[PDB]
Amino acid sequence: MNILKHFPSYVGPSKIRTLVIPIGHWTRKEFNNAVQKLSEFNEIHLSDVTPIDSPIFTPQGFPHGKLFFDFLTIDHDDALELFLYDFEPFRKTFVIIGLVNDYSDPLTNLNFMKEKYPTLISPNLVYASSTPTKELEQTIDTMENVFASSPDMQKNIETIMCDIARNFLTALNSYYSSYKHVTLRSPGAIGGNAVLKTTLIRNRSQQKSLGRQMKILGNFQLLAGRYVDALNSFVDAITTLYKVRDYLWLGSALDGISICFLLLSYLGLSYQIPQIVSLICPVENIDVENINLPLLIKCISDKVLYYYDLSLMHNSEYAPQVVYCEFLLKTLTFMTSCYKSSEFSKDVLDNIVKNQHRALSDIPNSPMFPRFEVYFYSNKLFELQLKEMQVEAQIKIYSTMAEVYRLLGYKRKQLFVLRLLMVALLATPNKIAWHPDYRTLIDTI
């Protein structure tokens, strides 16, 4: 597994973050192989899970959809990201996966699992054990949060990943149902003087709460898999929230409706762009085929960045540095993905959605974004004070910018940013455990 090899995709908010942990008597290499082989079935169609009772999040109301997953192993520290959950819910891990090989009792294991991770929505674990006891077979069969698989995850992985979908989707439904009544304070209002306010180095209430509620409803719809409904929610959430003269949340609403277009093209569905997004963002209403998509999304991202910048002078409704920097990286990776193909074919869309590079392809002539606009955009990362955030996030910027420069063929700038990465890594009071990623990094430098 790799720790300093981040490269966020433009459709990252659509991903469902999942934590995976080595229950029992695993070893490093074997567990790495197990999780790596497990991270190959994150494209499960919605047309194979049994329906859920409620109508909002029912799988059996949209035959298409993919319901992505994002397998992460590093447990990011809480108590700082907790504030910016009301702002957008695609941060918190929604499911834990236990890979257990010890022939232990599932009930107590699951109980302690939820004890150690109380803030989670739905824990569940898979028994990667070689021929467990037949007495344990019925015990695992009767309970829904527990599954069984052969060593290195090849027995019934399709059915397991089919069942987990509904298993956490019902819990997500319960979460949203308990969550729809909250007043939805801005992250600055929640955290106070605890989150950096993106230091650069370059009927007014109910009409606002209603728009914010619709925005998060659409965001949850996007997370679940209902894409057309998510867009039909974002149109209301963005028009009402632009009428009320609110900038911070409007940026995220415009973000979400921008992400919806990527996946709608990925599924291959015909859809008309809404009127309102055209009004608040010039084309420079109309079917997507009769309008260039990547340049439209570049303009939408520029407008989002404009609103984020315009939302800095407010004392408590400011954009955190984390959201700003990750959006910059997100759009930068979108730019680099666009700069690998002569046209916006399905190959580049699959590459950006599925997180696969296939680097050093034959360069075409006249790409979408030429190789100066991308560098000009990437320079914007240095425009903000990097050396104040936590090291965990700080290495993300340097690593993904190194990847960007490597893709662009700017090896010398890759050396520069990697040197900055090492300087940051060395300068930290907290000690760090050894990992082969550092070995590969030094080898590359």
Binding site: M1, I3, L19, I21, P22, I23, G24, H25, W26, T27, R28, K29, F31, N32, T73, I74, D75, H76, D77, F112, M113, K116, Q390, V391, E392, P429, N430, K431, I432, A433, W434, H435, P436, R439
Partner: peptide, 22 residues
């Protein structure tokens, strides 16, 4: 070596493989 030794140790259960903060 260190790679050949840490590549077959026993990870603690109920914990992430890697952690960043102290």
């Amino acid at each position: 070596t260190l790679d050949k030794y840490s590549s077959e140790e026993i990870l603690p259960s109920f914990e992430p493989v890697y952690s960043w903060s102290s």
